[PDB]
mmCIF file of C-alpha atoms in Angstrom:
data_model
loop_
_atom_site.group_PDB
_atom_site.id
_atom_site.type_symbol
_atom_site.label_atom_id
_atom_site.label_comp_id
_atom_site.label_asym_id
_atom_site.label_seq_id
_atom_site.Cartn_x
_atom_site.Cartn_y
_atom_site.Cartn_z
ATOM 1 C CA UNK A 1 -7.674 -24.538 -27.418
ATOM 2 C CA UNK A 2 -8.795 -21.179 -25.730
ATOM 3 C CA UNK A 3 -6.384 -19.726 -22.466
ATOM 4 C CA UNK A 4 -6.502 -21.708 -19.048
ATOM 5 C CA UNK A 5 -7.634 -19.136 -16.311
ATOM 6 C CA UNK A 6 -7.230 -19.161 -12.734
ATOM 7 C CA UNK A 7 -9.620 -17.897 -10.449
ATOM 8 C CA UNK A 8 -8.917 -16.485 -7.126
ATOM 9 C CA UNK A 9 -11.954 -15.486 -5.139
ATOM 10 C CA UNK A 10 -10.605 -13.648 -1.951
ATOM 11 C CA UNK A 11 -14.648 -13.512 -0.602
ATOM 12 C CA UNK A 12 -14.506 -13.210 3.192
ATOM 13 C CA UNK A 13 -17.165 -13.545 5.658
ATOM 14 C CA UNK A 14 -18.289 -10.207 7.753
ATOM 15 C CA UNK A 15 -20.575 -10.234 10.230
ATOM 16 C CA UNK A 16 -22.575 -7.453 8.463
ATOM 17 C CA UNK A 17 -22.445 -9.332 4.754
ATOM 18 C CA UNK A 18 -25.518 -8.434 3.019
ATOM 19 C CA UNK A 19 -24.761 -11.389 0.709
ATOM 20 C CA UNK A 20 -22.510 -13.012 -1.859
ATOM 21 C CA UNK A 21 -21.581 -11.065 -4.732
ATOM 22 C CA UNK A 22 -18.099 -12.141 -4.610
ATOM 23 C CA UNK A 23 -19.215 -15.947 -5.007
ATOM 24 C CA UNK A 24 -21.710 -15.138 -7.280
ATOM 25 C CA UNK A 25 -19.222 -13.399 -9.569
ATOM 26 C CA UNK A 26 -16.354 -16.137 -9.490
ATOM 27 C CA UNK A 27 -19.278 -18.454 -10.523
ATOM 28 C CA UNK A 28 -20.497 -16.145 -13.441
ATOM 29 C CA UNK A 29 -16.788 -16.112 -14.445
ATOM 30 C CA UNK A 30 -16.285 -19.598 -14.450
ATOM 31 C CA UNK A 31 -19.367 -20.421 -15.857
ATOM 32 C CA UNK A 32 -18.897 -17.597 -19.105
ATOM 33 C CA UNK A 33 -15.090 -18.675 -19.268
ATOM 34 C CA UNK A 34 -15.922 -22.591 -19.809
ATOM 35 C CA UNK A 35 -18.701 -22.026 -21.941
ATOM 36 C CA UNK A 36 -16.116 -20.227 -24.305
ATOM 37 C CA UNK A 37 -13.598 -22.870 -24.335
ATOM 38 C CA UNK A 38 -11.059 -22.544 -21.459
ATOM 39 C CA UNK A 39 -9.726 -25.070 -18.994
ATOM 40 C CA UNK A 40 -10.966 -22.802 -15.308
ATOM 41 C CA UNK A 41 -9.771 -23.632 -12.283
ATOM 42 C CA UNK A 42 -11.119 -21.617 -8.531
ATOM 43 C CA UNK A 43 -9.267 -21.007 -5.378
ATOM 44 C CA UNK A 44 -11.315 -20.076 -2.551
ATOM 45 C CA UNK A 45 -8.919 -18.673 -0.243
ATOM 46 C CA UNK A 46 -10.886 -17.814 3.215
ATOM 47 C CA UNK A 47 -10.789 -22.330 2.429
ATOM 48 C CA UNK A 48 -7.030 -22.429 2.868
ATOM 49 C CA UNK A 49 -4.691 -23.556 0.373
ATOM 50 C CA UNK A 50 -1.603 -25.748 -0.280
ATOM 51 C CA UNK A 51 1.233 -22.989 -1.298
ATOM 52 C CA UNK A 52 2.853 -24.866 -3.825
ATOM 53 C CA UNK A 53 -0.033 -26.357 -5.224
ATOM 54 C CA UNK A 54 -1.011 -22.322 -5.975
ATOM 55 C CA UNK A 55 2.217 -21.569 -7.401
ATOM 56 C CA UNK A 56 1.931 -24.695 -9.645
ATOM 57 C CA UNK A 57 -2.027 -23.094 -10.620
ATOM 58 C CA UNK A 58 0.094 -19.753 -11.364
ATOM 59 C CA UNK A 59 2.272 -21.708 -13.739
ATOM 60 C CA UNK A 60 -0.364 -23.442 -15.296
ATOM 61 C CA UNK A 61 -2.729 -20.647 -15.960
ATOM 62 C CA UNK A 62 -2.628 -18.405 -18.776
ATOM 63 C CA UNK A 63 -4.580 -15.495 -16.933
ATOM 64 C CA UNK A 64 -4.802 -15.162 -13.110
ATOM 65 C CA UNK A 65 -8.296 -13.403 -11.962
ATOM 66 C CA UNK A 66 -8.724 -11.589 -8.742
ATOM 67 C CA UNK A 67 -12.508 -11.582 -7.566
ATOM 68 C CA UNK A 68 -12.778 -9.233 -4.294
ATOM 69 C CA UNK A 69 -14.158 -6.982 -1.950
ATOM 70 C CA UNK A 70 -12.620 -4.034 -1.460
ATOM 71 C CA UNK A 71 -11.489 -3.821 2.837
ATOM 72 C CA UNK A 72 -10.020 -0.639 3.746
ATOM 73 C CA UNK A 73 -9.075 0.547 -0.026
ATOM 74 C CA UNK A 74 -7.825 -2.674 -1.230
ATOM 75 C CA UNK A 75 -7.455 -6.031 -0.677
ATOM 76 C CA UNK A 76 -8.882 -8.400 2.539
ATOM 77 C CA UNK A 77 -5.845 -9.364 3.944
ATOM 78 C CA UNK A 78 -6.568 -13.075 3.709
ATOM 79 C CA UNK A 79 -5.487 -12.188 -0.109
ATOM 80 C CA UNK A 80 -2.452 -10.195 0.999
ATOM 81 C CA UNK A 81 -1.478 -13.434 2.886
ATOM 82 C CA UNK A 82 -1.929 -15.731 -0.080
ATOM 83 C CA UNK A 83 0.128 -13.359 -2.337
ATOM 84 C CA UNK A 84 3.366 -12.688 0.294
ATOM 85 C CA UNK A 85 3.210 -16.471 0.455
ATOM 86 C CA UNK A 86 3.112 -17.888 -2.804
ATOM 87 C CA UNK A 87 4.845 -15.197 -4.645
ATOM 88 C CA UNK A 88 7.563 -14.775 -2.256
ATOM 89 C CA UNK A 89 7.572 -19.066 -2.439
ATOM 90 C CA UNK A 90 7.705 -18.959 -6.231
ATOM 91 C CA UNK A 91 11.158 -17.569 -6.270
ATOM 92 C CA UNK A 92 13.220 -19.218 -9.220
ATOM 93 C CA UNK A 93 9.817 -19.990 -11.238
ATOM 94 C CA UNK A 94 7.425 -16.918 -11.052
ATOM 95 C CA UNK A 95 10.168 -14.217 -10.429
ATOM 96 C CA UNK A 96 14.154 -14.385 -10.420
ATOM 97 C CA UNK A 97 15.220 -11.091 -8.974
ATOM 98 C CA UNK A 98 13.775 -7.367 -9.141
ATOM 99 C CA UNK A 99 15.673 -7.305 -12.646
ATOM 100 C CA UNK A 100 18.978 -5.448 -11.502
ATOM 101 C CA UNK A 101 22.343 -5.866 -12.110
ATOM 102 C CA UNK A 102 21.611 -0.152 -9.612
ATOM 103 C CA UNK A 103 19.317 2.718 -9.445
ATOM 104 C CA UNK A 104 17.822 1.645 -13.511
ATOM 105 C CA UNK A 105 15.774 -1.579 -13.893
ATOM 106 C CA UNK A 106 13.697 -2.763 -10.970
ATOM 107 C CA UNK A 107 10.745 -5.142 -11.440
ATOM 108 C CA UNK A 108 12.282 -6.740 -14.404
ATOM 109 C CA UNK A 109 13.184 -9.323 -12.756
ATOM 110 C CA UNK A 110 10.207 -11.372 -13.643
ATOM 111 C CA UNK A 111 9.613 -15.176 -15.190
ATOM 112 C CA UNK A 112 5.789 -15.204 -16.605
ATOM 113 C CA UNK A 113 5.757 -12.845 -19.002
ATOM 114 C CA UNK A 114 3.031 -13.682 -21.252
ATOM 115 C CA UNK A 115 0.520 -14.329 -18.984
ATOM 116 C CA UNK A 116 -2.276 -11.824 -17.670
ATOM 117 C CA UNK A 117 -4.226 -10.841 -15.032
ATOM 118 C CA UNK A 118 -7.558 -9.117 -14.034
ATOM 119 C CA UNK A 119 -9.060 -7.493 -11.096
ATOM 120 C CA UNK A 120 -12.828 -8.016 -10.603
ATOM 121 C CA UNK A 121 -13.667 -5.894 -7.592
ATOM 122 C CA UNK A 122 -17.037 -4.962 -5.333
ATOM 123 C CA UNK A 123 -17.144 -1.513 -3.605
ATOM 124 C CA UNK A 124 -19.492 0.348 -1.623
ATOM 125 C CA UNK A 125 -18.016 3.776 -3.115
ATOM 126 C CA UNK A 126 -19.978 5.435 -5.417
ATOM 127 C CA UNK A 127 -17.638 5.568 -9.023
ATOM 128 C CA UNK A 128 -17.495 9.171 -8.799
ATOM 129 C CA UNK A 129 -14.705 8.940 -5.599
ATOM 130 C CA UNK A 130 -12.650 7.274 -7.901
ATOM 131 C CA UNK A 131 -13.189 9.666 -10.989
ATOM 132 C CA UNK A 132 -14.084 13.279 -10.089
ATOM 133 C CA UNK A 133 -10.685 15.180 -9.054
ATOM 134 C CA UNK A 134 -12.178 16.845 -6.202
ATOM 135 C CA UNK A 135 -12.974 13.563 -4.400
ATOM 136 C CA UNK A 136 -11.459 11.536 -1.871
ATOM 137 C CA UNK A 137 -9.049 9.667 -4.780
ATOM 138 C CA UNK A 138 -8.341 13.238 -6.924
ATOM 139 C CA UNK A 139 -8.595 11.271 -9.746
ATOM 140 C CA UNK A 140 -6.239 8.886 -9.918
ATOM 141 C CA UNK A 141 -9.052 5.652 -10.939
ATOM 142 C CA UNK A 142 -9.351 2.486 -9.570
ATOM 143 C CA UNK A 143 -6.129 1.804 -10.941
ATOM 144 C CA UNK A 144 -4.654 4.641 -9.299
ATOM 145 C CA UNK A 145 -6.098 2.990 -6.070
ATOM 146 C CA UNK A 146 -4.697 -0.735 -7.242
ATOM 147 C CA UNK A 147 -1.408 0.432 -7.809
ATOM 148 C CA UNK A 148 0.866 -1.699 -5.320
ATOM 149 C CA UNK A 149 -1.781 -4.799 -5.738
ATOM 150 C CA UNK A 150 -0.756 -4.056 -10.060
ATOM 151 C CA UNK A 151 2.704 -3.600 -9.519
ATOM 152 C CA UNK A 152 3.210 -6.880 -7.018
ATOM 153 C CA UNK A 153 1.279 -8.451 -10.213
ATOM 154 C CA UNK A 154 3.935 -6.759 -12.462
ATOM 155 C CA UNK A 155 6.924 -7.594 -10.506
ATOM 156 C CA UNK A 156 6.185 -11.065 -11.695
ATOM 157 C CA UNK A 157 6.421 -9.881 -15.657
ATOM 158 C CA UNK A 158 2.850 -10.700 -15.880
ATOM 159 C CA UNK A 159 0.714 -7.613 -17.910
ATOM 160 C CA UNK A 160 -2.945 -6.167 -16.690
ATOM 161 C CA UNK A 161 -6.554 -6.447 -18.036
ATOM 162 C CA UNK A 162 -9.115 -3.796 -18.209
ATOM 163 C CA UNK A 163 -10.410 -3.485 -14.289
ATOM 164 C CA UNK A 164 -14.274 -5.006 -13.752
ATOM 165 C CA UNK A 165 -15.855 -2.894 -10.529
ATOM 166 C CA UNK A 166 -19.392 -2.810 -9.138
ATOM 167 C CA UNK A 167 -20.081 0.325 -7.146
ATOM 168 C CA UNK A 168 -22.274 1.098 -4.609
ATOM 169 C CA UNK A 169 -23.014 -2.790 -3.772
ATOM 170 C CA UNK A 170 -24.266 -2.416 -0.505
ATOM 171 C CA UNK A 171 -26.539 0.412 -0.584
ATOM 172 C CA UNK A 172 -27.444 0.413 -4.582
ATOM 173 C CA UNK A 173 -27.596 -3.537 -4.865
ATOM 174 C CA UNK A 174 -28.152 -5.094 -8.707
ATOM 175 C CA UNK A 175 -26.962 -8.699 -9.041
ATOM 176 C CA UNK A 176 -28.900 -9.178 -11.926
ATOM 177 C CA UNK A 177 -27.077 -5.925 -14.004
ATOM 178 C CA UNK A 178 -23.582 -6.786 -12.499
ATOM 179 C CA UNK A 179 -24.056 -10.112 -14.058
ATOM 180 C CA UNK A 180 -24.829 -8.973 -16.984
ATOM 181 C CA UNK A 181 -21.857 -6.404 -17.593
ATOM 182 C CA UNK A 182 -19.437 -8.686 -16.238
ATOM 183 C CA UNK A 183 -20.333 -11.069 -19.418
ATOM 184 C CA UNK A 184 -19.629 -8.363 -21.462
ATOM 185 C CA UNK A 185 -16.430 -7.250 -19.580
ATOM 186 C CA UNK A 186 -14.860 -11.289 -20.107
ATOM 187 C CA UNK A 187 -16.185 -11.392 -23.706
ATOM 188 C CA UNK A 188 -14.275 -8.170 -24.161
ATOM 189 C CA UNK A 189 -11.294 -8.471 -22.274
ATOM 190 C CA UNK A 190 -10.490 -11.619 -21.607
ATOM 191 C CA UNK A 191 -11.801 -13.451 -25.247
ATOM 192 C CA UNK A 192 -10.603 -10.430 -27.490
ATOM 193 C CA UNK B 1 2.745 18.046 27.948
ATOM 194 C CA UNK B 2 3.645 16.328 24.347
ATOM 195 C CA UNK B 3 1.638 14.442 22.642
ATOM 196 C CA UNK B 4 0.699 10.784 22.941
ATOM 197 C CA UNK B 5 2.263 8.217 20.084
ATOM 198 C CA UNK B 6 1.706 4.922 19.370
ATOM 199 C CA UNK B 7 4.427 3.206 17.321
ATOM 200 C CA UNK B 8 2.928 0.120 15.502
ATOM 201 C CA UNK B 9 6.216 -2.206 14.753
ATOM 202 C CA UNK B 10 4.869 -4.645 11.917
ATOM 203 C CA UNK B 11 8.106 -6.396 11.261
ATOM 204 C CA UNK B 12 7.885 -9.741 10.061
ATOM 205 C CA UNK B 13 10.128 -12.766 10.265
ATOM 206 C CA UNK B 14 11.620 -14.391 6.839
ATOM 207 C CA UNK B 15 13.478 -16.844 5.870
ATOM 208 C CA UNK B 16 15.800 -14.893 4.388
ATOM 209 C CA UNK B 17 15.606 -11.852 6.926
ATOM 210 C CA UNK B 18 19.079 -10.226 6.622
ATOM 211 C CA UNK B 19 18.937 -8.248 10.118
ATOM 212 C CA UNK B 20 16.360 -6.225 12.191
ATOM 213 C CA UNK B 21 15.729 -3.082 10.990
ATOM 214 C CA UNK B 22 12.521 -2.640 11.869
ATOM 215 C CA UNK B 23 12.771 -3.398 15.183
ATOM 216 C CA UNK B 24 15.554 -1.008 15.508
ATOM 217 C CA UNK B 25 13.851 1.838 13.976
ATOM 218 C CA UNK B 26 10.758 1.050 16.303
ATOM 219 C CA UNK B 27 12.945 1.408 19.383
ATOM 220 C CA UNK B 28 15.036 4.819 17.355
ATOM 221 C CA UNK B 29 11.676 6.197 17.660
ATOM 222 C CA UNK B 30 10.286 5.155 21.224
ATOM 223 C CA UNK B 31 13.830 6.552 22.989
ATOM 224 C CA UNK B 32 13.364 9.891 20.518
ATOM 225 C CA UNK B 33 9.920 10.597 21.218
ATOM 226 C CA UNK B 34 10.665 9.684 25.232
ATOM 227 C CA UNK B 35 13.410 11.866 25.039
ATOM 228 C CA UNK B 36 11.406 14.878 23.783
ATOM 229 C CA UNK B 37 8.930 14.819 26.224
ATOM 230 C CA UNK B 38 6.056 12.222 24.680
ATOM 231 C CA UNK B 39 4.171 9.311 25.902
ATOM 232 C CA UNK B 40 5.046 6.113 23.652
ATOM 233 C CA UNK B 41 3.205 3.090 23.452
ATOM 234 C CA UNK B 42 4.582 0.168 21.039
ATOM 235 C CA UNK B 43 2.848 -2.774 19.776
ATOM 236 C CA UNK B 44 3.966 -5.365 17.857
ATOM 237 C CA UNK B 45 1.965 -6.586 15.610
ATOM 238 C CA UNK B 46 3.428 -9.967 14.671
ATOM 239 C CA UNK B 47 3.337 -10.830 19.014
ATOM 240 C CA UNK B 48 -0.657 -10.963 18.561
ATOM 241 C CA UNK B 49 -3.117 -7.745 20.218
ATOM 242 C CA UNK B 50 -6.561 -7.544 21.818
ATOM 243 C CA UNK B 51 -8.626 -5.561 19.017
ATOM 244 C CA UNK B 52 -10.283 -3.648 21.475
ATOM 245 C CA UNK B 53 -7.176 -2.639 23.480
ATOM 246 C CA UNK B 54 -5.856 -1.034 20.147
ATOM 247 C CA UNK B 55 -8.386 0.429 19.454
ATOM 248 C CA UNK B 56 -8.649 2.067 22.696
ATOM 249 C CA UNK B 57 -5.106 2.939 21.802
ATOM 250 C CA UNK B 58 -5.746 4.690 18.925
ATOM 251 C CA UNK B 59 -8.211 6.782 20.821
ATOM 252 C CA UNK B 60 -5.279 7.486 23.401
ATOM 253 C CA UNK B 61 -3.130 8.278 20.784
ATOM 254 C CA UNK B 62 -2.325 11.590 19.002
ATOM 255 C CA UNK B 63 -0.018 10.464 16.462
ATOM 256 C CA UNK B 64 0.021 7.057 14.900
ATOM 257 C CA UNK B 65 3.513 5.991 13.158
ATOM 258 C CA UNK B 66 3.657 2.966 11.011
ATOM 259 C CA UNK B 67 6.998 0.985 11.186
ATOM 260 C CA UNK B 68 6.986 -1.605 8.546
ATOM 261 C CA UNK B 69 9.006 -3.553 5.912
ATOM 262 C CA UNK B 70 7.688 -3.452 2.173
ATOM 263 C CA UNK B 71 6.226 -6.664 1.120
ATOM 264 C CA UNK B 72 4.726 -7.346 -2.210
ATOM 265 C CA UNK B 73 4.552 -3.333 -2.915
ATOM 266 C CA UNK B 74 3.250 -2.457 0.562
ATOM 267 C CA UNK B 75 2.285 -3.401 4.048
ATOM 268 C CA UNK B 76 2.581 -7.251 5.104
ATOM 269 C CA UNK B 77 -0.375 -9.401 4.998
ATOM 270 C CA UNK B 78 -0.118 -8.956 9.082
ATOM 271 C CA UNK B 79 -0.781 -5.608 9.024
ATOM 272 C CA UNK B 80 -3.248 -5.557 6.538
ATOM 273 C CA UNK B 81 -5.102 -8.331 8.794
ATOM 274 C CA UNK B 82 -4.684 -5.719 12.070
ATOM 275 C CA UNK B 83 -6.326 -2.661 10.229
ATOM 276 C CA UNK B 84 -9.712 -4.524 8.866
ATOM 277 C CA UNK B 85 -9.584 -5.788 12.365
ATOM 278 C CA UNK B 86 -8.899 -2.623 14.166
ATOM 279 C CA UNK B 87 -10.760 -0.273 11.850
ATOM 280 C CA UNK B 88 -13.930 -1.973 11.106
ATOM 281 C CA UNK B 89 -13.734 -2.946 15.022
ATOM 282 C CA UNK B 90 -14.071 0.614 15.746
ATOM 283 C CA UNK B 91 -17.051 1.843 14.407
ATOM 284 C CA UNK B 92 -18.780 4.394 16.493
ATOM 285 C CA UNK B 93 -15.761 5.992 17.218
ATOM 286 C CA UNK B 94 -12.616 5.907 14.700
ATOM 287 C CA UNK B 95 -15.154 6.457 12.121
ATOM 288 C CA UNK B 96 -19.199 6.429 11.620
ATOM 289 C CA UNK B 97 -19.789 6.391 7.799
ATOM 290 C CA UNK B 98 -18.278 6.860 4.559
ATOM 291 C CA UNK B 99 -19.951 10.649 5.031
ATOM 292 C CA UNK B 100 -22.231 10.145 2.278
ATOM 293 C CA UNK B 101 -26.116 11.328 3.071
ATOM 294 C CA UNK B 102 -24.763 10.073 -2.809
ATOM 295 C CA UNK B 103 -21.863 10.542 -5.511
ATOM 296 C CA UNK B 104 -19.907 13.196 -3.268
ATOM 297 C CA UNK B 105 -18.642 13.374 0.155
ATOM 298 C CA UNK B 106 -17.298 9.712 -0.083
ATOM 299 C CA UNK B 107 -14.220 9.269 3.015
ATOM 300 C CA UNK B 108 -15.805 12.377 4.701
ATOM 301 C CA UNK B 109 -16.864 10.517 7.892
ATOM 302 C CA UNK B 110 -14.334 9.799 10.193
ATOM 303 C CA UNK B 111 -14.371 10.674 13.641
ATOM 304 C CA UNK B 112 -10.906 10.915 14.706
ATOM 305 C CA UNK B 113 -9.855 14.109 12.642
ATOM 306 C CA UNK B 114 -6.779 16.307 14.645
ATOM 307 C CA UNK B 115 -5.085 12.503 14.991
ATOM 308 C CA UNK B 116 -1.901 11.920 12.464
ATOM 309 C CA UNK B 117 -0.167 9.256 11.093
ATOM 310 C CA UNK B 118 3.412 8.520 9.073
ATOM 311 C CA UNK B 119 4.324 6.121 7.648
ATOM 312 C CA UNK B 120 8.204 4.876 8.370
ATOM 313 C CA UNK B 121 9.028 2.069 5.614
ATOM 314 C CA UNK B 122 12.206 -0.156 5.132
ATOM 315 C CA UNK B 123 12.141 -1.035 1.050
ATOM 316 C CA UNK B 124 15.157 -2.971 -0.833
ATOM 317 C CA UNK B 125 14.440 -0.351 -4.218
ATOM 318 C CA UNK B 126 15.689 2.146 -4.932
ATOM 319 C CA UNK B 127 14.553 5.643 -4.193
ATOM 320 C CA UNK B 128 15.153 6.383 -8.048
ATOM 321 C CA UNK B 129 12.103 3.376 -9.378
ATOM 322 C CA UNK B 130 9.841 6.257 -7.151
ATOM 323 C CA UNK B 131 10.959 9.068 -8.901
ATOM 324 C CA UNK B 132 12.400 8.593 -11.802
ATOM 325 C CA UNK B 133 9.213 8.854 -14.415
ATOM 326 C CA UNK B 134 10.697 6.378 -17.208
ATOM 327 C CA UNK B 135 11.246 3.508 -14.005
ATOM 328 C CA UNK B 136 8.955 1.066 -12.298
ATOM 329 C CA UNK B 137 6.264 3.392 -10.744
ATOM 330 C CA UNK B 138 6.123 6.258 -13.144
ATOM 331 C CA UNK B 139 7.021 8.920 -11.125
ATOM 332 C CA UNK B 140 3.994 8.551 -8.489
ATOM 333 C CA UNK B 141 6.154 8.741 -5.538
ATOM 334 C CA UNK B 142 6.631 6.586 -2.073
ATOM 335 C CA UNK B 143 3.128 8.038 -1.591
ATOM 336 C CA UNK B 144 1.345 6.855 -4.658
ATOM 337 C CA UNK B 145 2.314 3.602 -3.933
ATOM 338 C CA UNK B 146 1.056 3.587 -0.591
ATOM 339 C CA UNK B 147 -2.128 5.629 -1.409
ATOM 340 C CA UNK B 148 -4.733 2.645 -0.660
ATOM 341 C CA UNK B 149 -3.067 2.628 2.730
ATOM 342 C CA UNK B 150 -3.126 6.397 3.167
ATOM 343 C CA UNK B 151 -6.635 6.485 2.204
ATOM 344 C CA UNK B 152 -7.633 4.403 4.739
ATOM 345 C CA UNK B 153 -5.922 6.710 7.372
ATOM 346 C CA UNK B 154 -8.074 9.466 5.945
ATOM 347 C CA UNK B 155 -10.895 7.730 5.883
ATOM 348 C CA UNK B 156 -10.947 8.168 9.413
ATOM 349 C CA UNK B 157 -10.065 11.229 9.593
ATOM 350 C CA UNK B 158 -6.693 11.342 9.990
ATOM 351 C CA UNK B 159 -4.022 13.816 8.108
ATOM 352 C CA UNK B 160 -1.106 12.532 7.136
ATOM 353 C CA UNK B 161 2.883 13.466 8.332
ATOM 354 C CA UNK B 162 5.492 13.684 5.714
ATOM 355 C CA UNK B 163 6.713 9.503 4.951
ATOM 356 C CA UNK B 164 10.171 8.132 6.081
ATOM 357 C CA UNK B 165 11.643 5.176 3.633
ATOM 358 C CA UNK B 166 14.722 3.485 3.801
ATOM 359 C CA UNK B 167 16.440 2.124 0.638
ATOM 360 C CA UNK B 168 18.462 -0.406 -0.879
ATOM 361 C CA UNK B 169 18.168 -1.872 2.776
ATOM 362 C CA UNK B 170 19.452 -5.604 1.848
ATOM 363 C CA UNK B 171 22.297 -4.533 -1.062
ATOM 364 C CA UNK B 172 23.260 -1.228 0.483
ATOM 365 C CA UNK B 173 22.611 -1.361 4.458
ATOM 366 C CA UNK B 174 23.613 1.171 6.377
ATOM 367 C CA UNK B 175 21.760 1.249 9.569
ATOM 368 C CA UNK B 176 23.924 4.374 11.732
ATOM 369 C CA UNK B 177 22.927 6.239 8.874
ATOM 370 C CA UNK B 178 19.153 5.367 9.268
ATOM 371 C CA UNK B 179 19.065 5.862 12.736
ATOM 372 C CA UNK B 180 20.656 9.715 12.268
ATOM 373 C CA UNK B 181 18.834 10.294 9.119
ATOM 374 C CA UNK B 182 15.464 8.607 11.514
ATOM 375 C CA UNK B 183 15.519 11.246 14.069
ATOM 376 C CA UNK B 184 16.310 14.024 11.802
ATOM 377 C CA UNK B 185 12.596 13.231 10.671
ATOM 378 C CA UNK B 186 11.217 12.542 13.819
ATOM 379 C CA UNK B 187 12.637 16.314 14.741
ATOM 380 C CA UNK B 188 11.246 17.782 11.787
ATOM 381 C CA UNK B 189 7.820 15.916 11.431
ATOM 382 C CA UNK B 190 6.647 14.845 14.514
ATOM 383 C CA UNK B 191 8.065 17.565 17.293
ATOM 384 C CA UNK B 192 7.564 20.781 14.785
#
């Protein structure tokens, strides 16, 4: 009886796509998650979705993972959407309140504590923006980068996994090698 | 002969919408900047826009202010949808690369440097889960948790002006207060 996992892959079309590493990715998950014993369900959300019917995946799932480009430093917005709509909608069942009752306690609010969540994410930046204090991030991580897209996640009660990121996807392609970490990323953070 | 602004009013209608700050603050800022010698173009973001037209706006523009309510940790999903519009739209001239020619220089190619941008946010927190190092965001600041969207500002080229927020805006309103408080940082931000 291994952890029911919910994947959301936020993929979204471009007219300059060089291919599909976000749906290739949700498929390795899927594929690596049910071969180890979990119950997997995918939302494709550039296909639309039923709000409640997400919320209801939410409750279901032990672990909720995010598979998706990076647009302008974070998410497409077609994933922005789907989160101000079904965690705004989940009110009473994924959150309560932001946990006061005024200045001490915000996001404590929450009502899935327990539950966990991972973001899988493709970049064109090379890792080094994200790491070397001199660069364009000073430092800060992908995390550092993440931080409102972690904290909505948070909000919620709902506690982070090790970040998966592929760098340099467009102009230093390797499905193959991606493929292969990734494996090891799930085995290691998601099965440990 | 003061500069040209563009105030982009992302307010977004709720179910549970307690007034119209946003709006307000929009306006605060159009009659300021009016008054003080600027030309102000507004658009509203949840009324629909021609990509190209804003585009062509930001090239008009010299100083871009954000207007927006918090959602989910940052900008609603309807601004998030406007900027991979807008920005990816305008390649060739808001930006050419990422100014890589391959682990440094990421964010260095923009095209639209002397341009700035602020960001003018209406958030129910408190000012204290910013600052406060033992609360929500560790100490990291309005700015931290708005650094994907900053970054993507810079990425084009653009510097950033010191942030407005407004707090406690649905327990604690007190709009005459915003408004004064508003063009106090208008004064000191945008005219100095």
């Amino acid at each position: 009886a291994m952890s029911n996992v919910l994947i959301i892959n936020a993929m979204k079309e471009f007219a300059h796509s060089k291919g599909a590493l976000n749906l290739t990715l949700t498929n390795v998950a899927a594929d690596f998650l049910r071969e180890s014993g979990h119950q997997v369900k995918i939302t494709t959300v550039d296909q639309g979705y039923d709000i409640e019917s997400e919320i209801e995946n939410y409750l279901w799932a032990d672990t909720i993972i995010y598979q998706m480009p990076a647009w302008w430093m974070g998410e497409p917005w077609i994933l922005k959407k789907y989160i101000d709509e079904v965690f705004t909608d989940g009110h009473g069942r994924l959150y309560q309140s932001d946990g006061r009752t005024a200045t001490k306690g915000y996001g404590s609010g929450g009502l899935i504590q327990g539950k966990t969540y991972m973001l899988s994410v493709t970049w064109n930046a090379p890792r080094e923006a994200f790491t070397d204090p001199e660069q364009f991030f000073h430092g800060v991580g992908v995390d550092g980068v993440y931080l409102p897209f972690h904290k909505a996640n948070q909000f919620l009660g709902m506690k982070p996994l090790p970040t998966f990121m592929c760098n340099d996807v467009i102009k230093q392609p390797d499905i193959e090698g991606d493929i292969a970490r990734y494996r090891q990323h799930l085995a290691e953070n998601v099965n440990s």
